[PDB]
Amino acid sequence: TRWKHQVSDNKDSFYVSLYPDFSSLSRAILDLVQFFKWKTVTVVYDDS
Amino acid sequence: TGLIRLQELIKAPSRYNLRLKIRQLPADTKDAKPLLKEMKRGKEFHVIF
C-alpha cells in the first residue's frame, strides 16, 4: 500500500502495489508545470 | 540509486551558477547510440558518467 523503489533487475513477480506509480505522477506534475508556462522552478524534497 | 550517489552535485546549483542536464542510460546496454546522438544534438561538452 506504500511506494517503494524497485531494483531494475529484481526478478520477483509475486507482488502488486496499489500506490500510484511516481513515473505517471511525475508526468502529471510535469504536465501541470507545462500548463502554467513556468521557466524556473524549485523542487524541495525531504529524504533522499 | 545513482541519484543518491550524486545528490550533492544536483544540490550544487543552489549555491553556484552551474547549469546541468541529467540523462539516464536505457535498460539495454547496447542502446547508448540514441543517448550519444542526444549528446550530439545539444552540443554539450562536459559529461559526467
The CA radius of gyration of chain A, in Å to the nearest whole number, is 15
**Gap between the Cα atoms of A2 and B25, Å rounded:** 27
**What one-character-per-residue DSSP string does A1-48 give?**
-------TT----S----SPPHHHHHHHHHHHHHHTT-S------S--
Q: Which residues of B touch A (CB under 8 A)?
A: 1, 4, 7, 27
The grid coordinates of residue B12 equal 550544487
Buried-state track B8-36, b at ≥16 Cβ within 10 A, e below 16: eeeeeeeeeeeeeeeeeeeeeeeeeeeee
For residue B9, give the 3-state DSSP assignment.
Answer: helix
The verdict on a CB contact (< 8 Å) between A5 and B7 is no
The C-alpha atoms of residue B37 and residue B14 are separated, in whole angstroms, by 29
The verdict on a CB contact (< 8 Å) between B1 and A48 is no
- Please indicate whether, in this complex, the C-beta atoms of B4 and A5 are within 8 angstroms of each other: no
